[PDB]
A paper describes a structure:
In this study, through rational design and phage display-based screening, we generated a novel class of recombinant light-chain single-domain antibodies named VHHLs and identified two promising candidates, L6 and L15, which demonstrated specific binding to mCD16 and favorable biophysical properties. Unlike conventional sdAbs derived from heavy chains, light-chain sdAbs represent a novel class of antibody domain that utilizes the variable region of the human light chain for antigen recognition. In summary, we established a light chain engineering approach that combines CDR3-grafting with site-directed mutagenesis of CDR1 and CDR2, providing a rational foundation for the subsequent development of VHHLs with antigen-binding ability.
The results showed that L6 bound to mCD16 with a relatively high affinity, with an equilibrium dissociation constant (KD) of 54.3 ± 1.41 nM. The crystal structure of L6 was determined using molecular replacement with a template derived from AlphaFold3 predictions. The structure revealed that L6 adopts a typical immunoglobulin variable domain fold, comprising seven β-strands arranged in a β-sheet core, with three CDRs extending outward to form an antigen-binding surface. This geometry effectively creates a broad, contiguous paratope surface that may enhance the antibody’s capacity to engage with flat or groove-like epitopes, such as those found on the surface of membrane receptors like mCD16. Collectively, the global RMSD between the crystal structure and the AlphaFold3 model was 1.63 Å, with 78% of the deviation localized to the CDRs, underscoring the limitations of current predictive algorithms in modeling engineered antibody topologies. Notably, AlphaFold3 failed to predict the co-planar CDR arrangement observed experimentally, instead rendering a more staggered configuration that may underestimate paratope accessibility.
Numbering used by the authors: 1 to 115
Amino acid sequence: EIVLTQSPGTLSLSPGERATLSCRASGSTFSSYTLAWYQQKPGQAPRLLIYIYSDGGRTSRATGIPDRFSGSGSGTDLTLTISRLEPEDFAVYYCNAESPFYDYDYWGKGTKVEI
């Protein structure tokens, strides 16, 4: 198994401020997975933001993303950084690791980012 730990648990910030979230992998971090940050605006489907290959080495942003989203780490530690909160960025943010073969898919517990 793998454990993901999102940190922080909540975030009470306000427009313009910076937000830095981080996902920690532990357990069998020496397999192949993809570590991804997803955003989930309420009432909407998750959205891939950034991701990185567990064993393969640079991060990528998804298609159609503003610059306010950045990723940094090796792939046992993704950090999503939204630099300057715009209004709609107040959402719930999740990370998962996923085997390319889908024999394992693990999700964090969530990081709520509100005002």
